[PDB]
Design a binder for this molecule. Structure first.
Ligand SMILES: [Cl-]
Ligand SMILES: [Cl-]
Ligand SMILES: [Mg+2]
Ligand SMILES: [Mg+2]
Ligand SMILES: [Mg+2]
Ligand SMILES: [Mg+2]
Ligand SMILES: [Mg+2]
Ligand SMILES: [Mg+2]
Ligand SMILES: [Mg+2]
Ligand SMILES: [Mg+2]
Ligand code: NA
Ligand code: NA
Ligand code: NA
Ligand code: NA
Ligand code: NA
Ligand SMILES: [Sr+2]
Ligand SMILES: [Sr+2]
Ligand SMILES: [Sr+2]
Ligand SMILES: [Sr+2]
Ligand SMILES: [Sr+2]
Ligand SMILES: [Sr+2]
Ligand SMILES: [Sr+2]
Lengths: 154, 160, 140, 186, 95
RNA sequence: CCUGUCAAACUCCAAACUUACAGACGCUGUUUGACGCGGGGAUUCCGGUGCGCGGGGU
RNA sequence: AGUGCAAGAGCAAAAGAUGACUUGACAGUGUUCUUCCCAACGAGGAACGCUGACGCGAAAGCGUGGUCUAGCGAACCAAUU
RNA sequence: UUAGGCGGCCACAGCGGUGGGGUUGCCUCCCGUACCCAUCCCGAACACGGAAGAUAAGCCCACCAGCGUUCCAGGGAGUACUGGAGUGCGCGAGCCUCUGGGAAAUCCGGUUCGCCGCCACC
């Protein structure tokens, strides 16, 4: 399970690439989705590789992100342990977080929005013109490297 | 005409003589120089002139560089000296010129050029150990008459 | 082994390449059967502009009709070594050509499942000379 | 053979066994082929339909399995040819085959030949095959009367092995009678 | 194009690779397809008759009946539906 | 035999890629009716630039 | 190689050659594609059927002209069946 | 299939080569023209009739790789080329990094001297 974050806008970007982002339920910049690691989903992230930031998050970081940014399918309601308990098949945020990572369920399946609408990176990111290997913030990241981004976007 | 008009590889490969008529003859007199009866492996030293940029060299530039290179070897090693130089590239690319404004712009045939890629050998001379510094000077004169910058690389010689 | 390997006469082709007919009568008298006309292809400048026109005649002789001809045909010419084919046939001359081959040539002349005769079963120039020499004449 | 550009014919053409142009025209009907083949000593007649991995033979008949019914005479002639065709046609009726098209292969369409006799036999057995009555031999040559009139020019016997002296074309009639009977073990 | 003929720009698709030269095998020219079956459209360069317009090479149509010996195959060219008359010689079964 | 070069109108080879159909995932539609069909009204048929691939031309 | 003529393409027990027989270069009416990719548009064209009548062949079958892609023309008026 | 018939794929099956195999059996070559049929001339072929002889052809069986072909290993090569991205480099033609694909020639070493279907048959 990878976590996609759009870091580059829609303007001047190819339609077939923009449409893939909308299929992956990510419509705005700084929006995040939890995509499983299958062959079909792999082709989709490879196509968006240059306008996105992805990688597998740590159980600890995914938990923090879900607490602060996860929303219901409809509504303002905070997704805390008590919310999870009353609507989901789990007990707390940790139970959900484990299942998402082990690819047992999805956010939509549990009545949560497929999108985690994050805040802009605190202290800024490494740049949108270069990939990770070149010192930028695009493409595949380390499990520690994606966490720095997702935690900075609390 | 200047080489600026024909040096770059921008037009398609136009070599098909069955569709092209009135092509001027090659100004290149010889391709095999020196002692063409003796073999290349009979010489201890093999030095080549390597073209650094991907270019298109005209038959006149090919003749001028070959003539100013072999003439130095005829001067320093004698007319029947112990060397053999080879020009491995041949002028295949047929060149045009629009010589009426831009209407019916397809030009008439004016010459021929050789497509040489970067890193390739234009000239290759095979000599002995004592005549090694004379050939490096023949290439110094030969590179001044073509379009790109060049390398004088020794491919068979640990005698330094 | 030797019985199915010993050569025989397949066909004796007697042809007269004239160029423009009257010579059909002399063949039917010397051979014993009916002759056939010979046509030509490609326009030649020696006043030979017509394609489908009789230029000569030929007769192909089989079995008895072939041997009863060669008894009187062979003494009429001096046979040489350079007068032989690589396949073991010979022509002398009025042209007289004798096609010699081994007992299983039908395999290459039939319709159903025909195959070409292997190099080993094909007649040699030397193996041909010996067969004719063994029948009333000299070689060299 | 010579290089990469070289074109080697199809296997059955290389072998000179199948005429692929005549095969296409034959298969265009949709009916099974009455494969009429002949050897020097024997005569074969197959009823072939088309299949996914190759040809399917639904009912065959060789002139060798003709002796099983009462044939003491040779197997590569006109009476044998008809009877092999009749035997093939009868085995075809018990398989469910009603109609067929004559395949002669690389044999010639010569008027009154053994392959046309194979066809006459199969039609007589109850099979619907497109034919031409005046291209088939007259009823007496099919009987083997031409062989009896050759044995009249005796002096020296025609047959080596003892079957008879002056030949019996009545054996054809004795066998056609045995095959027309429904009791027979096919 | 320089001319708008049916065989324009068809040097490659209507030519056989040297080893696929000569007369084609009959098995595929007699092949029986049923209605509803998905078929691939590819012209056999060795077979002259029963061809379709070379623009439709590579189409995977659906057999919707027949006209004589030839088949009526339904395709969708761009967004427009067309019915193609084609013989078995130029058709291959999908899968 | 050896040795030196080429091809828009060459090819024993041969991608990336584009493309038909089908399944799957995704997304979308069944009160926001998609897909499709029928009808009313247009405007429009001087375009331009970047990038990639071009063809002509110094 | 040849296959009437550009070019590209097809063809070898043939689509080429020979020979012989023959007039399907036939009448009528369609389906479809093309003309006009997608996507509307005439004439023209082609593939593929049916009805009628024929030719050849043992027969399956082939012949809606020439192996395929050029060789074409509205309304009005006249002539013709 | 102790030799056959009809095929599918249509060279992995081609080209070339070595060895083996046939009393009432099979396939052939073979013997032979009264007839059906036949040759613009030839029972050569086609067609028909038949077994005195034969395993030399063909064919069937086993096998050889020199040529041609198929595929595989390794090397060439993640090279050549390339879909997506870049306030990366170069006066420029052009190049480079990241991401996703990925050859061809040739050399060396294996493979390949057909596979499969239906039918009939000591
Ligand atoms: Cl046969
Ligand atoms: Cl069409
Ligand atoms: Mg909401
Ligand atoms: Mg700040
Ligand atoms: Mg920045
Ligand atoms: Mg092309
Ligand atoms: Mg008028
Ligand atoms: Mg008039
Ligand atoms: Mg033997
Ligand atoms: Mg710059
Ligand atoms: Na002017
Ligand atoms: Na073919
Ligand atoms: Na029309
Ligand atoms: Na004549
Ligand atoms: Na043998
Ligand atoms: Sr240019
Ligand atoms: Sr220079
Ligand atoms: Sr394209
Ligand atoms: Sr035609
Ligand atoms: Sr004979
Ligand atoms: Sr400059
Ligand atoms: Sr790979």
């Amino acid at each position: 399970m990878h976590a996609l974050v759009q870091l580059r806008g829609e303007v001047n970007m190819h339609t077939d690439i923009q449409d893939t982002l909308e299929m992956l339920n990510i419509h705005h910049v700084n929006h995040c989705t939890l995509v499983p690691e299958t062959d079909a989903y792999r082709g989709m992230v490879a196509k968006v590789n240059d306008f996105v930031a992805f990688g597998e998050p740590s159980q600890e970081t995914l938990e923090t992100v879900l607490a602060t940014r996860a929303e219901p399918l409809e509504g303002d309601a905070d997704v805390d342990d008590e919310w999870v308990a009353e609507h989901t098949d789990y007990d707390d945020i940790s139970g959900l977080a484990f299942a998402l990572l082990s690819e047992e369920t999805t956010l939509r399946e549990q009545g949560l929005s497929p999108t985690l609408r994050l805040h802009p990176p605190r202290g800024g990111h490494d740049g949108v013109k270069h990939p990770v290997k070149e010192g930028g913030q695009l493409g595949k990241h380390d499990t520690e490297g994606i966490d720095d981004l997702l935690e900075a976007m609390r | 005409k200047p080489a600026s008009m024909y040096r770059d590889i921008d037009k398609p490969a136009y070599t098909r003589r069955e569709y092209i008529t009135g092509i001027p003859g090659s100004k290149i007199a010889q391709h095999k120089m020196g002692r063409k009866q003796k073999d290349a492996d009979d010489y201890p030293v093999q030095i080549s002139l390597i073209v650094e940029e991907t270019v298109q060299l005209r038959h006149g530039s090919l003749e001028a560089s070959r003539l100013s290179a072999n003439r130095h070897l005829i001067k320093e090693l004698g007319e029947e000296g112990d060397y053999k130089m080879t020009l491995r590239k041949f002028p295949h690319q047929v060149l045009r010129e629009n010589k009426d404004g831009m209407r019916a712009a397809f030009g008439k045939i004016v010459g021929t050029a050789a497509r040489v890629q970067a890193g390739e050998q234009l000239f290759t001379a095979y000599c002995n150990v004592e005549d090694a510094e004379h050939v490096k000077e023949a290439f110094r004169r030969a590179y001044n008459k073509i379009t790109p910058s060049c390398r004088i690389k020794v491919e068979r010689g640990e005698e330094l | 082994f030797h019985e199915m390997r010993e050569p025989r006469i397949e066909k004796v082709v007697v042809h007269m390449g004239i160029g423009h007919a009257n010579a059909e009568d002399i063949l039917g008298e010397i051979t014993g059967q009916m002759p056939v006309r010979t046509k030509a292809k490609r326009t030649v400048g020696e006043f030979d502009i017509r394609e489908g026109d009789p230029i000569g005649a030929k007769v192909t002789l089989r079995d008895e009709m072939a041997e009863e001809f060669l008894q009187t045909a062979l003494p009429l010419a001096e046979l040489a070594t350079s007068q032989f084919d690589d396949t073991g046939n010979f022509s002398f001359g009025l042209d007289v050509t004798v096609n010699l081959v081994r007992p299983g040539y039908r395999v290459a002349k039939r319709d159903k499942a025909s195959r070409s005769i292997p190099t080993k079963h094909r007649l040699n120039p030397a193996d041909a000379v010996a067969f004719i020499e063994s029948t009333y004449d000299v070689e060299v | 053979a010579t290089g990469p550009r070289y074109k080697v014919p199809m296997r059955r053409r290389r072998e000179a066994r199948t005429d692929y142009h005549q095969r296409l025209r034959l298969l265009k009907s949709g009916k099974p082929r009455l494969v009429a083949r002949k050897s020097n000593k024997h005569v074969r007649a197959q009823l072939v339909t088309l299949g996914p991995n190759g040809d399917d033979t639904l009912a065959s008949a060789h002139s060798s399995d003709l002796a099983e019914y009462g044939w003491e005479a040779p197997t590569g002639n006109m009476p044998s040819a008809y009877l092999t065709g009749l035997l093939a046609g009868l085995r075809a009726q018990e398989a469910g085959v009603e109609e067929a098209v004559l395949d002669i292969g690389l044999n010639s369409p010569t008027p009154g030949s053994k392959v046309f006799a194979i066809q006459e036999g199969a039609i007589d057995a109850g099979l619907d095959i497109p034919h031409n009555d005046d291209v088939l031999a007259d009823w007496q040559r099919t009987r083997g009367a031409h062989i009896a009139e050759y044995d009249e020019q005796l002096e020296e016997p025609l047959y080596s092995g003892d079957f008879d002296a002056a030949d019996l074309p009545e054996h054809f009639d004795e066998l056609r009678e045995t095959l027309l009977d429904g009791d027979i073990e096919l | 194009p320089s001319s708008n003929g049916p065989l324009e720009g068809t040097r490659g698709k209507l030519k056989n690779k040297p080893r696929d030269r000569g007369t084609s095998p009959p098995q595929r020219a007699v092949e029986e397809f049923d209605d509803g079956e998905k078929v691939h459209l590819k012209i056999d360069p060795s077979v002259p008759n029963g061809r379709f317009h070379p623009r439709f090479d590579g189409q995977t149509g659906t057999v919707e009946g027949k006209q004589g010996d030839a088949y009526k195959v339904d395709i969708v060219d761009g967004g427009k539906e067309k019915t193609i008359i084609v013989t078995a010689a130029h058709l291959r079964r999908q899968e």
